[PDB]
């Protein structure tokens, strides 16, 4: 599992469940092509987005749909989404965990990269 | 000053100086068109981006060039940039401050919206 | 102003106003003795805590009463308070800003140390 | 496992390994009595601090030795440690995960509380 996403809710102190996540990869013409998508589980984790074969070098964008998450909880948040944009696999295959910690007017994102 | 940006460096414990910031407004065809830009000052702040007359309701993207900032310090970064996307909504007088706290493999962003 | 404290609210996207802050200095017997205190202003800032003459090298603790802040807003918090513990070191002119970004089940703190 | 601690390094994008963690519980005389301690593994996780029987109601303090972590990496950090202070189990037993994200001049902490 080369790309995993974890989302936590800083208001409730819980995993953020059922958060939609869309991954894009920059194409040769510099547009964002759709790459993979999914939603977080009851643990706040999203596994199975991609495979070692599919997850080639490139510039990837992970768009976490934080607005829909907050709206479903009856909350009007500030951001449209949380975006993480990074170059992947430039020195060979790595495993990436993108973590996001959500508040209505704030978010933090961190990456854990392992070989 | 309806829109201000502040950037902090969590490695050195200092304002993030000379960071390029580009602001875009979402156009009717869903593209991002340039709206305002600048570089943070010695205090890590970027003032004078826009005026009340031109800062209308809409979806805005603030792109902070974190990768170039880290490279100028000789520090290896993860992200290509930090992207903060939000809707500006007229509800009485409102000033927007977008703050970003930068680390090489993590960033936090928050919005301070005051009257 | 050698020591300033700033507190932000990540749920409401606002300065955290009227937050009690107590500063302690570590004494020779390893106990924490009161040094300075106050409440954040309408801008979320607490100025005038100490003077350059009295703010000597040492270990300091900044206790932010986050629990009372959240209770006054009717929001259920996790932490009893936020504690920021650091050594002040004389190395040329130095001003210390301790910033805290508050959510009910999370907080971030950073130090901005300038000349 | 009712109390677990996870620590990540925001400079390297990795688990923070071999971080010492000391847990205290407030005694009847209002002093901090030692409760449990350990160090993070290669995954940045610390398991086995306590048991369901031992982890009674009370006010607990989790002190994460961030200064030693940074010093071992040849880095001079700002904070002495990262402290998390919270009331536990007041509405019955819960499971607590305390996560900490570390930078030399900044840290974030979050709690995930499950039933
Ligand atoms: O989701 C997390 C956040 Cl927001 C902060 C911290 Cl200090 C830990 C976690 S869990 C987690 C996050 C990442 Cl990037 C990698 C792994 Cl292996 C985790 O367990
Ligand atoms: Ca390559
Ligand atoms: Ca409107
Ligand atoms: Ca000294
Ligand atoms: Ca009870």
- Cα of first residue to Cα of last residue in chain D, in angstroms, is 12
Tell me which residues of chain B, numbers 36 to 75, contact chain D at a CB-CB cutoff of 8 Å.
Answer: none
CB burial of residue C15 (10 Å; 0-12, 13-18, 19+): buried
Q: How many whole angstroms separate alpha carbon A82 and alpha carbon B67?
A: 18
- Report the alpha-carbon distance of residue D108 to residue B103 in Å, rounded: 12
Say which residue the tokens 């923070």 belong to.
D16
Collapse the DSSP code of A71 into the 3-class scheme (helix H, G, I; strand E, B; otherwise coil) and give the result.
Answer: helix
Q: What does residue A71 show for φ and ψ, rounded to 5 degrees? A: -60, -40
The Cα-based distances of B67 to A27, B29, D15 in angstroms read: 20, 29, 22
**Cβ contact C5:C98 at 8 Å:** yes
- Tally Cβ neighbours within 10 Å of residue A26: 17
CA of B89 to the centre of ligand 3 (A): 5
Give A54→chain C minimum CA distance, Å. Answer: 36
DSSP-assigned letters across all residues of B72-115: HTT---SEEEEEEEEEE--SSS-EEEEEEEEETTEEEEEEEEE-
DSSP string over chain D: --EEEEEEETTTTEE-TT-EEEEEEE-TTS-EEEEEEEE--TTSEE--S--TTT--SEEEEEEE-HHHHHHHTT---SEEEEEEEEEESBTB--EEEEEEEEETTEEEEEEEEE-
D61 to chain B, minimum CA–CA distance in Å? 25
The 8-class DSSP code of residue B44 comes to S
The CATH number linked to C31 is: 2.60.40.180
DSSP chain C: --EEEEEEETTTTEE-TT-EEEEEEE-TTS-EEEEEEEE--TTSEE--S--TTT--SEEEEEEE-HHHHHHHTT---SEEEEEEEEEE--SSS-EEEEEEEEETTEEEEEEEEE-
Q: Which is nearest to A7 in space by CA: A36, A45, A39, A42?
A: A45
- Burial grade of C114 (CB within 10 A; 0-12, 13-18, 19 or more): middle
Residues across chain A: 115
Residues of B in contact with D10 (CB under 8 A): 10, 103-106
- Contact yes or no for B113 and A107 at CB 8 A: no
Q: Chain D partners of C83 at a C-beta cutoff of 8 Å?
A: 83, 85
CB distance B110–C13 less than 8 Å? yes
What's the number of domains chain D is made of? Answer: 1
- CA–CA–CA angle C66, C74, C47 (5° rounding): 35
Q: Which residues in D lie closer than 8 A to residue C87 (C-beta atoms)?
A: 80
Q: With beta carbons less than 8 A apart as the criterion, state whether C104 and A13 touch.
A: yes
Give the CA angle between residues B20, C45, C63 to the nearest 5°. Answer: 110
Residue D10 tokens read as 């925001």
Q: Which residue has the tokens 């601090």?
A: D49
Residue D96 to chain C, least CA–CA distance (Å): 11
Which residues form the domain of B27? 1-115
Ligand 3 ion: Cβ-proximal residues, 5 Å cutoff:
B 89
Backbone angles phi, psi at A114, to 5 degrees: -125, 155
For residue A106, give the nearest of C10, C78, C104 by CB distance: C10
């Amino acid at each position: 599992c080369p790309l995993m996403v974890k989302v936590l809710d800083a208001v409730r102190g819980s995993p953020a469940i059922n958060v939609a996540v869309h991954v894009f990869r920059k194409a040769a013409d510099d547009t964002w092509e759709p790459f993979a998508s999914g939603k977080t589980s009851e643990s706040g984790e999203l596994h199975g987005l991609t495979t070692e074969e599919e997850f080639v070098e490139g510039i990837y964008k992970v768009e976490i749909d934080t607005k829909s998450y907050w709206k479903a909880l009856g909350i009007s948040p500030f951001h449209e989404h949380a975006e993480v944009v990074f170059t992947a696999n430039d020195s060979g295959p790595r495993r990436y965990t993108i973590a996001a910690l959500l508040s209505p007017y704030s978010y933090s994102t961190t990456a854990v990269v392992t070989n």
